[PDB]
Design a protein around this ligand. Structure first.
Ligand SMILES: [Zn+2]
Ligand SMILES: [Zn+2]
Ligand SMILES: [Zn+2]
Ligand SMILES: [Zn+2]
Ligand SMILES: [Zn+2]
Lengths: 367, 367, 367, 367, 367
């Protein structure tokens, strides 16, 4: 079938980029709905307003309700209509950015996306996860277009808790291994075709950037300052990992992440932290060479990502819990069937237990 | 400053992709102006109409006037308005595709771009070159967005004259060397920022794909059939070279190409054929190691790209002509000043003469 | 699914091995039907009788009818019953050996197989090709067991025309590439499961033996003498290529060989000669790196195997003929669908034309 | 612009070289002002006088006042005039040698320079740092010529405290990284042109000599004996590092050293000790690969050079102090702007904090 | 003994450097004797006068007599005294530059040296070769100082006949092999000590620059234009080869060059052309590995340097002539005794004949 790659129209990254938002947004639209939660607007609203006003743009500030829900999208659409907004700016973290993307689709207007953290692969993607008002997961909204613009102010990102940058590393770490799996199996990506060479190259660059820059970047993150290593990792966590998963393909790591909602244990952990362990499990499943498993586990441990079930607070009654995770990971429609040669719940169960044993040995040897 | 990468929203490539245009275009818009010249519509209009009609889309066919001019854009805008078109599909070669992009911008509608040849790096870019009705160059139109969609039917491409695929190789060959030059000098790209790692990786993938697949692809092109090598080269000539030049940066090769309009001699040669020699000249200018110059010249010769002035029909009174080319390449605003350490017309003149001498020696040794 | 490897029970190879047949066959059975054509018995019957008689075994000599047909199998079964034979020895080339294997199955007795040439991968396999009495192909007989014993007298083999050893090299050359293709795609082998590591290792050893020993062995073959290089190649052509195709898997090369019966042109060429070109076509289809295609073509040319259509006397009206070959190679049930990612007749047609162009260029450069 | 390298006219190094001063100085001039402090003349004056007297040269011994000041230069010029001196010999450490160079310039006579320690890159350079009589920094005196002669008695050097040899290693360690930075950015050197290949080669030899010989040399230094390793390091600390910085270029390490005078904390540490940490900070700033940062930190630690702020007695209120250091390092005219792509105080501040964190981790892992 | 390196005080190289002579010379002296022959002043005197006049310097132009003789030095000293010159500028080729250096020594004034060709290793050295007025060799004048300043206008150099640049390559080619020989044997250099690491590194850089850039530079030289390759080779031929021979050491190649004055045959060839063959002979003498001899001969042949006696017009009666050359090369005081392990005329004779045989074979294989 056809090979397809999707991307946001324009990805912008640099220190102080928020100050230049007005100039970047002007060619797209003149009147912007600005969606962000109270915490994000607390530190960004003044800069936001000045940049847009100085560029001659209008801004209607709309504090975010907290959930990406159909009710919240309709509430913001009503607000935007009163100010005759012709575009949407989402600023903040994942739920805010998903809402802005979904809202812009239903209004059929450009969307600009300003992540204030680099903790997940989602901002660049043509996807919104819909939740109920209560925060329960409802559905996946496949969008027909990626965001027009993604603008990453790396000095804002460097101010976030360092754990969120490491979580982004966990999300981005899966990118190469899942895209490679899909390339080998010929699976269809979320872009709707087979993997391109471009997406594979970006996914492999993602992985190598994390290997070369991940530890250097964590040092900057913990000091809340911007160095080139942090800049490269932020790009890897956002653009490379975004295009990599969407146009490169998802596989076992993503499906194992979703399977962990079949148990309550890991609720306090971030998407990327669970994905890190899911990647180690995937490496067992594909029988990756010891050197490769070793390198991934070392990378994870060096930035504090979990490599054992216990590091995700998954403890006690492990056979029962991993059977639950394995069956859910292998449900109809889950991306684990993109693995070469097919996989069933018995193989995933085995991989989960062996990956945990392997992380336990790694941690022990490390002392 | 900020680092920026731009891309078309969705790049689609495969054999028979034209048959699936309707399904690919439907999520963007319902009523399409279809712009193509009489030759392209001669072979594609029936397939086009069936795909769009079967998807429930409307199509207003508008035979292209031949020039990307303000008059032609206004003519097509008038035609589109009568059919209440809400999007533009350009199908064919460069002038058609530039017109469709410019038209879609002035109507503020989505644009889909269907190249029927893979001969230049332009289709994916946020650029239209405006000409007079007479075909004289008028201006560069910087567009605020890349095309929403680029759809490359590789079986249509394989039907084109093989010389056009080799010309695309010439255009794409410059991509890595110009982006690397801009990365080293910190020049601003046409995306408006400094080069990203993503664009550099795509530009380097472009070059390596040409080295690994260029000769295999030419064999398929000359037989007018699709093999994976031809698929990889078409991607390299279109997506990788497009994003690579726009977000990676232009330098001496592009400026030397433009300088050759200061003389009449090479008028019968394609953009990519002149760019191939401009890349060799750039390698002299940056004093590339002999192995690297050797590899580029061998690649060029293996697909029939020129590596001497005589192969561009530039003969006789070479000192005068190359002085004219060198002065024009170094004019204010030309991308040759993106070269590390700066360059003046004396250095370009020297490089032109030495590159030609080097291609002459290469050709001789090759017998 | 399960991973399965099949093998003959005992594979014996060495100079003068025919003289030791009696001692090798005695532990299996006491009374042997000996099937061979008049030419083979002309040089081997005296040695045969002495070896079996000296070991205390009975031999009923049954001159072979020439075709592996149901009538011939019934004729030999009747002959064997009159002598109360309890085992079958086939000695000679493919049709004789297929008959002996099929006969032994229908009598349910041990079979010993003594190839006098090393020209195909068939002797060790659990397969008999059934023909009509007229020599037209009838059906594939999948046998439930591989031969009990295969005995290769390399001094007899060295006496055969050298072209037959090179043909065996052509058959064996496909082994690694087809088994690798099936390993990558997870196709089912004729052993009835997925590929084992053992079969993959044997198939890769086959290929490397041909690269290292093929030319050394041809020199011995042309002089009709036995050297260790010829011994290694005979093993590669017989045991390694036999287990490799049956337990490693068939793919495009085998299917392209079968497709050439859709045209009359190559009737004068051996199975392995057509398979050599089918392997080159497969390398195009999987877009093998230039170095790998180069190495295979060089190996073929160094032993006289064809790398162009013209070297198979396939000339004139090539588009029509290759369309016929491509459609037949892609019929339902053909092993070309074991190729990773699936293949259709358009892709095979393209590969055939490009492989021929590539062999034409290779031959030209070689002068 | 032009490429320029400067050097002292003659650089002499060996055990007992002071004994041969007379023969080395005779071809330059007959009557020498000898400037050294009371400690240096205490051990060297007798040898000095004998060597010059035996060669038929006159010597006027002038005990050094302690500061390289305009008053001290005028005092020594008056002393020299009474003895009709026609040349100047400075013997000892930096302040003495700067005075001798400045004095020789104002008298317009040859100067010979005899360092008794190898602790800084200054002796060979066409530079004198002028201070007030009080020891406060006054100005940089760019000299029009390098010293005519530099004579390094390595047995005198080996008698100095080993900490001074390690400090010289710290100064020399910056040489390659600063010259490479200036080569990449095309910055102007203190020689007044762009970097030559000669200076780059000498700077890279400096670095590799320190890697290969630094630890071997420290063992000799601590035992106060001369081995070839110590001889190579003395050359590296004096000639290679001297020509390397002056003709290769200064960058972030030098500017960060100067920035530390914006705080009082590190006053007890030598120039080369502060430059070692400034080099580590530069490596962060240029995002050097982890292996390279690792190698430099290991080299520093192996000879006792600081790799943390605390090892420079910079403790407490680190954000305030590093902001002060960063702003001063980025002042107009500072060599940090020779870094490729430009650098501002925010980037230096970040690099300082991250380099310190990195040295802290290195020290911890080392136990 | 001591290790010593000597250098000119300031080496300047770039296109148009002559135009900046005034600014470069001003800090040294105010009133300049300018010595050059009628041809050099014919193209340079106007530029010379403008640069010096614009800088406020006086110039007394003194057309050169043609020979570096005691009479010529006295003639120019008389001329200079009438204009109260306080410095000497020599501009042109070797005889002019030797005269200027010798003159400046006898006047005890600064000397600046401006080679207009890059054909020998001499300009930077503290050496003048004295001849009679008739042009017969008289003596070697060892100078106590290297020139204060060497200024190489590479655009003037590029205008010279390309054969002179290749001759400079021949001179510079010996540099590494002679310095390495002296380092291995511990011979004393003309700097008066043993070899330093700095000089060895510069000599090895010389050789590698010629290998990497020699052919690229010749192309520019033949086109009379400046490229970076030509700039690197000019530096190699002048600074690196100058300091390399003087501070690195001379050996067999230099002595064999001098030995060829024992016969009349090669009088039409340049110093560097004879030195190229002397280097090949040295490689035989030290039994260099075949790869190394091969590489040097290939380098020589690629720029037109001789690798046979016949290419130096040394033909007929070769045993007699080479005995004469060998005895002279081994005379008392000749640098051939710097070769490791000592060498006598029998060994040199053998090496000469074998080197010639080797060049003859090389030329033959090259066709
Ligand atoms: Zn994820
Ligand atoms: Zn182009
Ligand atoms: Zn076969
Ligand atoms: Zn310093
Ligand atoms: Zn010489």
């Amino acid at each position: 079938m056809d090979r397809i790659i999707q991307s946001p129209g324009k990805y912008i990254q640099g220190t102080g980029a928020i100050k230049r938002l007005g100039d970047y947004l002007k060619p797209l639209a003149e009147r912007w709905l600005v969606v962000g939660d109270k915490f994000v607007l607390g530190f960004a609203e003044e800069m936001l307003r000045k940049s847009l006003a100085d560029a001659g743009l209008a801004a209607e500030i709309a504090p975010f309700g907290g959930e990406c829900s159909h009710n919240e999208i309709n509430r913001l659409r009503d607000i935007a209509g009163n100010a005759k907004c012709t575009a949407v700016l989402g600023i903040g973290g994942g739920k805010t950015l998903d809402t802005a993307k979904a809202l812009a689709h239903f209004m059929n207007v450009p969307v600009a996306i300003a992540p204030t953290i680099a903790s997940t692969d989602a901002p660049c993607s043509a996807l919104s996860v819909i939740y109920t008002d209560e925060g329960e997961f409802d559905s996946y909204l496949m969008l027909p277009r990626n965001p027009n613009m993604v603008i990453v102010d790396t000095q804002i990102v460097a101010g976030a808790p360092a754990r969120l940058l490491a979580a982004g590393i966990g999300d981005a770490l899966a990118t190469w291994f899942e895209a490679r799996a899909c390339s080998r199996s010929g699976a269809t990506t979320m872009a709707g075709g087979k993997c391109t060479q471009a997406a594979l190259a970006l996914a492999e660059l993602c992985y190598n950037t994390l290997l070369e820059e991940g530890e250097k970047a964590m040092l900057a993150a913990e000091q809340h300052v911007v160095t080139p290593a942090l800049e490269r990792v932020v790009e890897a966590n956002t653009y490379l990992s975004g295009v990599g998963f969407e146009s490169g393909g998802l596989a076992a790591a993503h499906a194992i992440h979703n399977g962990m909602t079949a148990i309550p244990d890991a609720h306090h952990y971030y998407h990327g932290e669970k994905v890190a362990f899911g990647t180690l499990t995937q490496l067992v499943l594909e029988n990756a060479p010891v050197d490769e498993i070793e390198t991934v586990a070392a990378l994870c441990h060096s930035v504090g990502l979990p490599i054992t079930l216990a590091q995700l607070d998954i403890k006690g009654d492990i056979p029962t819990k991993m059977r639950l995770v394995a069956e859910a990971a292998c449900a109809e429609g889950e991306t684990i069937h993109n693995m070469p040669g097919g996989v069933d719940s018995d193989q995933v169960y085995a991989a989960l237990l062996v990956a945990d044993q392997y992380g336990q040995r790694f941690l022990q040897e490390w002392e």
